[PDB]
């Protein structure tokens, strides 16, 4: 809604993405899925760069403290309580789900906010997140499906 | 499983609980649900005290870094994407769900670990988390159910 609120969301979304992607990179690497690990390093790096841009913008404003559910990635499928996310197919899909949630926040903000800057950044940020979803879709396509057991 | 692993879980569970309870306390207070806010302040305080105990234990060991899904509270019901958790009935049930997940981790560790200390702390910690669930059940009983609209 407001630009302060929007920038708080954007920073939180990016801080979260950086952490979650490093974590996924680490897991890919540890099981020698080096290509997928690198997709996630790239994404974690984009988070840092983009987050830094948003942080420069936000120096002008007093930002609200957000609640965790406003920005955290959704918890993944809960089996058997603990792995599933160690396979590339499942990590990529998890990452994609949350890329989409971030995209949707940006699109919703750009549509419903009266502040033209929120409209502008929301649209810009949504378009870029959309390119991430498309890129992850291309990966998921080429990624073989694992079997349980 | 191992004591290092167990203590890493316990610390993470408590760091997480403290943050989540402060957050819920803040929301209760902000809507003048002062009794429920205080239940959550009490819990956040228990986290700090208990976490500090676990931290003293863990100085003896190199702890593994855990993945977020190993210790984070589950994300709450996702509607309409954003509130629901501002009502006491919904915050208490959310808190209870995650108290139960923590209890279950402790019980599972105590049952499946060969290390007698993990067995001992796991049982001790599970029994106390169980008292928290029972306390939240008593609250949920006395808490009126809200209506949407
Ligand atoms: Zn993205
Ligand atoms: Zn508890």
Q: In CATH, what number is assigned to the domain containing residue B61?
A: 1.20.1260.10
Q: Which of A102, A132, A123, A134 is nearest to A10 (CA)?
A: A102
Phi, psi angles (nearest 5°) of residue B117: -65, -35
Number of domains in chain B: 1
Phi, psi angles (nearest 5°) of residue A140: -60, -45
Give the technique used to solve this structure: X-ray
User: Is B27 in Cβ contact with A68 (below 8 Å)?
Assistant: no
CA torsion sign for B79, B74, B52, B66 is negative
For residues A92 and A37, is the Cβ–Cβ distance under 8 A? Answer: no
Q: Name which of A69, A83, A100 to mutate to probe chain B: the one with the most chain B Cβ atoms within 10 A of its Cβ.
A: A69
For residues B70 and B15, is the Cβ–Cβ distance under 8 A? Answer: no
Phi, psi angles (nearest 5°) of residue B42: -65, -45
Q: Give the ligand whose atoms come closest to the C-alpha of residue A18.
A: 1
Give the C-alpha distances (Å, rounded to integers) separating A3 from A116, A131, B143.
Answer: 9, 24, 37
Query: Can you tell me whether residue B60 is helix, strand or coil?
Result: coil
Query: What is the number of other CB atoms lying within 10 angstroms of the CB of residue B149?
Result: 3
For residues B64 and B5, is the Cβ–Cβ distance under 8 A? Answer: yes
Ion ligand 1: residues, CB < 5 A: A 99, 129, 132
Reported resolution, Å: 2.0
User: Long-range contact list for A27-35, CB < 8 A, 24+ apart?
Assistant: A27/A85, A27/A86, A27/A91, A27/B67, A28/A88, A28/A91, A30/A86, A31/A86, A33/A88
For residues A79 and B141, what is the distance between their CA atoms, to the nearest angstrom?
30
For residues B39 and B135, what is the distance between their CA atoms, to the nearest angstrom?
10
Residue A59 lies in a domain: yes
Residue A48 lies in a domain: yes
For residues B146 and B87, is the Cβ–Cβ distance under 8 A? Answer: yes
Residue A149 lies in a domain: no
Q: Which residues form the domain of B67?
A: 1-144
Q: Which of B12, B28, B21, B14 is nearest to B42 (CA)?
A: B21
- B75 closest CB neighbour out of A19, A72, A104: A72
- B72 closest CB neighbour out of A27, A75, A105: A75
Radius of gyration of chain A (CA): 16
Residue B149 lies in a domain: no
């Amino acid at each position: 809604y407001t630009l302060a609120e929007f920038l708080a969301h954007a920073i939180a979304l990016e801080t979260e993405a950086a952490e979650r992607y490093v974590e996924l990179a680490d897991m890919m690497e540890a099981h020698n899925n080096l290509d997928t690990a690198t997709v996630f390093r790239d994404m974690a790096r984009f988070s840092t760069l983009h987050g830094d841009e948003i942080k420069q913008r936000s120096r002008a404003l007093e930002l609200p403290k957000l609640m965790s559910w406003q920005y955290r990635w959704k918890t993944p499928p809960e089996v058997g309580d603990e792995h599933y996310l160690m396979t590339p197919y499942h990590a990529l899909r998890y990452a994609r789900d949350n890329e989409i949630r971030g995209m949707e926040y940006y699109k919703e903000a750009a549509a419903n906010s009266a502040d033209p800057e929120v409209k502008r950044l929301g649209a810009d940020f949504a378009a870029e997140e959309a390119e991430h979803v498309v890129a992850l879709d291309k990966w998921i396509e080429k990624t073989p499906r694992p079997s349980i057991t």
